[PDB]
Amino acid sequence: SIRLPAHLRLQPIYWSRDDVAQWLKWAENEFSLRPIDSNTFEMNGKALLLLTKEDFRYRSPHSGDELYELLQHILLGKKLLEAARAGQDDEVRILMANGADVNATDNDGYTPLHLAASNGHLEIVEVLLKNGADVNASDLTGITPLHAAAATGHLEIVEVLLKHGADVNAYDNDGHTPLHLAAKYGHLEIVEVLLKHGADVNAQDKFGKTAFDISIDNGNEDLAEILQ
């Protein structure tokens, strides 16, 4: 599969010169390509998109087409991220049928399964889990799709995640578990199903607060009483 370094996962329309340069450098090692002068592609990412494959070919008689098609590949990863967010089930099909890597990542570590579980698109989450989307991938803040699905209240999505291997005791960079965010947003039934599949109700975050305490600070006392 294909995975940009952390500094290149942004949309290429947003790349600077140096990003474009870092991308060329990166591509040269990954795919095992002959070293070229980056001043050939002397332009920011917004201009790179305007180039034709021939323009790629004549700049790099030895790797121009591969870089053109490589670029095209990452570009579909963004349209897949977008197709999984807006709920565009058809667009998710065409892109996965044209080769979309179902574990792409943007600048925020979001995968297409993160966005489809955070926004409530049950069909996309299932067709992503069926074609190999990582169920326990964590973004740069550590939020898993079960974090996003439990923080937003999507019960049928929290349950489908638990059915394919979603970790119920995953800790984020701030220490929060899926039972913490379900308590933060007042979703008792998700706290129920989380507590059914093995959620450590006594998990502590980096400030020392439990699911009871988050239910206290946010105003969910009926939930705070059920955890007590």
Numbering used by the authors: 13 to 240
Q: Could you pull the original sentences from the published paper?
A:
The ‘3-fold’ lattice featured more crystal contacts, showed higher internal order, and achiever a higher resolution compared to the ‘2-fold’ lattice. Analysis of this structure revealed three key interaction points stabilizing the crystal lattice. The first was a DARPin-DARPin crystal contact stabilized by a hydrogen bond. The total interface area was 307 Å2. The weaker nature of these limited interactions also likely contributed to the lower resolution achieved in this construct. While rigid linkers eliminate the rate-limiting target protein docking step otherwise required for polymer-polymer association and crystal growth, they may also hinder the formation of optimal crystal contacts, contributing to the formation of lower-quality crystals and reduced resolution. Rigidly fused target proteins have no opportunity to sample multiple binding modes in search of a binding mode that gives productive crystal contacts and so exhibit a lower (but non-zero) probability of forming strong polymer-polymer contacts.
